[PDB]
Amino acid sequence: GMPHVHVSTDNSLLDIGLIHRTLSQDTDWAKDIPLALVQRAIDHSLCFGGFVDGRQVAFARVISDYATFAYLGDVFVLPEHRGRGYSKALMDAVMAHPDLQGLRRFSLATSDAHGLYARYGFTPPLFPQSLMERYVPGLYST
Amino acid sequence: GMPHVHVSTDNSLLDIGLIHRTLSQDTDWAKDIPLALVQRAIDHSLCFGGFVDGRQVAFARVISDYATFAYLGDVFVLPEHRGRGYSKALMDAVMAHPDLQGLRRFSLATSDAHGLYARYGFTPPLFPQSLMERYVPGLYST
């Protein structure tokens, strides 16, 4: 039952339109995100695409200095491709990536997938009172 | 009483040795950080240096996709240069930088400077239970 999925970090293979539609329409965190921002974001991130039979089926995106800090977001698997290990394939590649080793902090935000990310060593923050943000959820809508 | 300080985002002007010594020896968050990691981090970040009379006096570092997310860290002013507005000069430049506009989330962690960052619009997290990390404080020591 092992997945047959290709995982790449070559942005040229990404299906930008698929990613844009998915993020814009089928996520809350990137609802209504403009195409130009999707493209710019990808251009300045370490992106993981998962592909089957010539089509993109999954995505994960890391923003990092490749030295001290990384942030994970935009993780998805298309609904018809779920339960096949494609999320795990991408996370395994993130955790193993040679430019994402030895980091002091790897951060993410999740509405309802805490148990999942816990299997990769993520925890609630050590020092939650230290954290601050300028955060505008729903920025792109209007 | 306005500061006379030059703020640059040109990494070629940075005094890498000063930054390395400062971070390694005079901060807790980067205690014992190796030079090679400082250099790599800088190479993959948007860095703000503050300079007076040919010497670097202050620093701030942003990791971002220049589209959706940024993380601020490594902020310092050398002790003999404090109280002159150099922190504010750098933060003003961060907040105004053309590649850091329109972001959904700008994040940071601070032990004891919450009131300060609050003046730039930073708040405690909206959704603290969503946050997770792989965080190893004191990674570089040993």
UniProtKB/TrEMBL annotation, chains A, B:
Highest taxon of source: Bacteria
CDD domains: NAT_SF
Any GO molecular function: acyltransferase activity, transferring groups other than amino-acyl groups
PANTHER family cross-referenced by the UniProt entry: FAMILY N-ACETYLTRANSFERASE, PUTATIVE (AFU_ORTHOLOGUE AFUA_6G03350)-RELATED
InterPro entries in UniProt: Acetyltransferase_Butenolide, Acyl_CoA_acyltransferase, GNAT_dom
Protein name in UniProt: N-acetyltransferase domain-containing protein
Every N-acetyltransferase domain range: 5-137
